[PDB]
Structure formats: C-alpha cells, structure tokens
Ligand binder design. Structure first.
Ligand SMILES: N[C@H](CNC(=O)C1=[SH]CC=C1)C(=O)O
Length: 288
C-alpha cells in the first residue's frame, strides 16, 4: 500500500471534517455525479496555541480524482495523509547546522513518510536534483491575486519592483516561489520584501487579500484563477510568469515513474484532464 502525501489546496485538494460517524458527507458535482472522497489523515487545527491532533478527514478534488485514476490504472492500493508541517517543501539548514534537509512534502517523500506526492506540486530543477517528477499533469504558472479595483499590471508593476510599506505583497512560506525570485539577481529586493510577510498557507493569504490586510498575493495561476473566478471580490492580474508544470513526485530511480508518466500522457490524450477541468476548475459563476 503506497503512502500518498498531499496538501490542502482548492480546487486540487479539498479537506473537510468527517461527519460524527467517521463517514464523508455525500455530495454531487454540478452534473449530478458523486463526488469521490478518500479518507486523509492529517492535522485538523493549525491555530497557534491549540493542540495539534492527527485525525481522519475527507479529501477530494482534481488531484484526488487523478489519484483514484492512477491507482486503478496501475493497480496499486494507497493511503493518503496531509503533510505534517503544512508545506510544499524548500531545502533548509537543519538544527542550526550547515547540513540541509527538505521540509514539506519534499521532506516526507525523501524520508519515506510518503512514497508519492500527489498535489499541485511545482516541477523545478532544484527539486529535481533530489526527487523525480512525472511529466506535468497540468501546465500553469505564477500570477497575482488582488482585490477587484486594485491598479496593478503584473510582476513588473513599479509598486512591486519599488516596494514601500504602503503596498504589502507576499507568497506562501516554504514553497518554490521564493527560490524562483532568489534565482534571478534582478528580482532581489522583491524576494527580500516578501520574506518579511509570507503566509503559512495559500488560504490564509487569499483571506488576507479579501480582508484588505494583503494587497497582492503571488501564487500558482491554477489556484488563483479558480479562487478569483469563485469569488466576485477577487481578481488576478498580469501575464502569467515562471510558467511551469505540476507533477507527481517520487523518489529517485522510482519503479513507478515511467508508468505514472504514461498514465498522465493518456489523460492528456483522451480528454480526461479536460473533464477534470470541467468538474473542478471551470463550471459556474462566482458565488464566493
Ligand atoms: N505549487 C507550489 C507553489 N508554486 C511555486 O512554487 C511555483 S515557483 C514557479 C512557479 C510556481 C509549490 O510546489 O511549492
């Protein structure tokens, strides 16, 4: 039985409590089909001061449908959990030493706490030095989420390039976004500004934009375009930049990689990815 690690990230992975009987609420898509739900164990409270408890929860969304299809096609059983520290994964010095380790889903894959990462996980060369990716199951990039009305053109807008205190922008801590900004000498002062204000999760950042506590949120277009399309008060702005895919993550020289990539190819070829899009990404008007 493979250990799948994932992360909360709508519309790819919804996370809800079980009902009182430990089951998952019966729900249907806009088209009347049952929403497929898997049990995922993970933390159910990330509020500072409250005790962390790992409990069974209900998971569903684009990546969960994708998982179910992979499991069927490649004849494997699995169990899903949510990444313990809440993070995608960056490489950090451990224990105040010069030794480095990966946190987030990257760390769990490398340590053996997971066998496969099934998540909106960005494919980049930094990560590919340590793990293997499938071919992209989705092609996307970064964009910028703002409140409707906000006068920002893109990543090259002077308000971003020349930051003051009167316009706060941020991304999510311990994602690959800070790495990409740090990997160009041009974008240095943006990275330095963001590090001061970054959020523990996308959901918190998004909420902060809604609540006028964050002016601009730099994040995956596949998530932000959904969020902005779901919430009439929120918009995206600017051209996509740092175009890149989402992939399945596996350890180096994994015997799963080739067949995972083959499954994803088939899904691109036969309309399955577009069906997922029509189920999870584009299906109705904004209703927050
Ligand atoms: N998908 C998340 C967040 N997105 C990213 O880091 C990036 S960097 C360049 C393009 C997308 C992740 O895997 O950490």
């Amino acid at each position: 039985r493979l250990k799948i690690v994932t992360i909360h990230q709508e519309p790819f992975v919804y996370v809800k409590p079980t009902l009182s009987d430990g089951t998952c609420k019966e729900e249907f898509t806009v088209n009347g089909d049952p929403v497929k739900k898997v049990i995922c164990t993970g933390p159910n409270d990330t509020s500072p001061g409250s005790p962390r408890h790992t409990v069974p929860q209900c998971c569903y969304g684009f990546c969960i449908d994708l998982l179910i299809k992979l499991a069927r096609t490649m004849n494997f059983t699995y169990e899903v959990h949510l990444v313990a520290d809440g993070k995608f994964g960056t490489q950090e010095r451990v224990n105040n030493s010069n030794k480095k380790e990966w946190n987030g889903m990257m760390g769990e894959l490398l340590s053996g706490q997971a066998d496969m990462i099934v998540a909106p996980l960005t494919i980049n060369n930094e990560r590919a030095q340590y793990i293997e990716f499938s071919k992209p199951f989705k092609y996307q990039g970064l964009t910028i989420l703002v409140k409707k009305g906000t006068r920002i053109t893109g990543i090259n807008d002077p308000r971003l390039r020349n930051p003051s205190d009167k316009f706060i922008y941020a991304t999510v801590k311990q994602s690959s976004v800070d790495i990409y900004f740090r990997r160009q000498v041009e974008l240095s002062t943006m990275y330095r500004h963001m590090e001061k204000h970054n959020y523990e999760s996308a959901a918190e950042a998004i909420q902060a934009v809604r609540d006028n506590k964050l002016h601009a949120f730099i994040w995956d277009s596949a998530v932000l375009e959904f969020e902005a399309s779901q919430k009439c008060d929120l918009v995206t702005t600017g051209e996509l930049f740092f175009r890149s895919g989402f992939g399945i993550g596996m350890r180096k020289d994994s015997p799963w990689k080739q067949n995972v990539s083959l499954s994803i190819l088939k899904s691109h070829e036969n309309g399955f990815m577009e069906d997922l899009d029509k189920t999870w990404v584009r299906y109705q008007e904004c209703d927050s």
